[PDB]
Amino acid sequence: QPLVGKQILIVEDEQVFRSLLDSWFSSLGATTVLAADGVDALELLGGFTPDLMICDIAMPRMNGLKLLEHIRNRGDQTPVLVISATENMADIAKALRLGVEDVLLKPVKDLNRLREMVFACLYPSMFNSRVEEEERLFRDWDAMVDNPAAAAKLLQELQPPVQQVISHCRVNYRQLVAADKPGLVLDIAALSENDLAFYCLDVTRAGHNGVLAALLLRALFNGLLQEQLAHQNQRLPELGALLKQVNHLLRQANLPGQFPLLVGYYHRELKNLILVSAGLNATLNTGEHQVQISNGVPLGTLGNAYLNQLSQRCDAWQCQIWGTGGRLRLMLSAE
């Protein structure tokens, strides 16, 4: 019973998931207090001091964002984990502005991730993991926007190694032209045992808002992709729709600019690469063919009409990617 002595307020209006969280936390030893909505949560906070809050957004009489606004105006600094089915990017941006430890988008696929995140909240000295650092990026968002040097340093520290194994696939890159240190930013991330996604961003076009956008995208890219596949009940994503959601996130986060981006996803069981570009030039070479990708127009404007997705079958590929910020070659092999 690791969580004995620790108090958790669960603010959730839907019965199945609230009972699920209540049972799971109680089995681990936590004292759980249940709130139907934001008003009920405030009344319960009149007589409970939680060590952690789990908070849904969409709720009848007060949504979780107004509850968060009230507790943070009162100077309460209790950690909050947001767990919400919301597809509204304004909600995620407002949650980040108000100060939260993390934002999980329902459905929660594996309980181990939520377990480690709760444990990072309730015992931060103990669970100083990668999850700790993700939550650190989530809660320090205001501190990041108010200090450009820290944001640039963090973005450079998050640039992945040039040689990796992700989802049983071999992934390399090389910067070829980088006159800017945070120039062409890259993220590559596993989604399951057998598929991965990646993004390459050009922060130099937009200046400082590029850097912040990169940080925000690193916090949330997987979460937005996973959610799409869960909510639309699909294995293979619709990356254009994802990038439209990314547009709405960067706009609602008050990060105006032009953000040249390429996003992709690979499934090794299906041997299936999917690519789409908003603003960056790219040439793919799959072993059998060379495919030149239409660069489209950058994110940061609404109405992007050129988010047309390209699918290719391959066991391995190399993509040259470039824009005004510089040049790199990203390389994958499924064997």
Q: How far is the CB of 267 from ligand BEF (least distance, A)?
A: 28
Q: In this structure, what DSSP letter does residue 217 have?
A: H
Q: How many residues does the chain have?
A: 335
Q: How far is the CB of 299 from Mg ion (least distance, A)?
A: 29
Which residue of 13, 22, 135, 227 would you call a contact of Mg ion, by CB under 5 A? 13
User: Contact between 40 and Mg ion (CB under 5 A)?
Assistant: no
Cα 232 from Cα 207, distance rounded (Å) = 35
Tokens representing 317 are: 């590929």
Cα 203 from Cα 256, distance rounded (Å) = 12
User: Contact between 66 and ligand BEF (CB under 6 A)?
Assistant: no
> Is the CB of residue 108 less than 8 Å from the CB of residue 114?
yes
Which residue of 72, 106, 248, 327 would you call a contact of ligand BEF, by CB under 6 A? 106
Cα 76 from Cα 5, distance rounded (Å) = 20
User: Contact between 56 and ligand BEF (CB under 6 A)?
Assistant: yes
Quick note: the x/- pattern for ligand BEF over 3-42, rule CB under 6 A, is ----------------------------------------
Tell me which of ligand BEF, Mg ion, none is bound by residue 248, counting a contact when its beta carbon lies within the kind-specific cut-off of 5 to 8 angstroms: none
Query: Which is nearer to ligand BEF, 58 or 236 (by Cβ)?
Result: 58
Q: How far is the CB of 60 from Mg ion (least distance, A)?
A: 8
Cα 136 from Cα 130, distance rounded (Å) = 10
Q: Please, which of residues 55-114 interact with Mg ion by CB under 5 A? A: 56, 58-59
Handedness of CA 229, 233, 239, 243 (dihedral sign): negative
Compute how many residues bind ligand BEF; rule: CB under 6 A. Answer: 7
**By C-alpha distance, which of 314, 102, 293, 71 is closest to 200?**
293
Residues in contact with Mg ion by CB under 5 A are 13, 56, 58-59
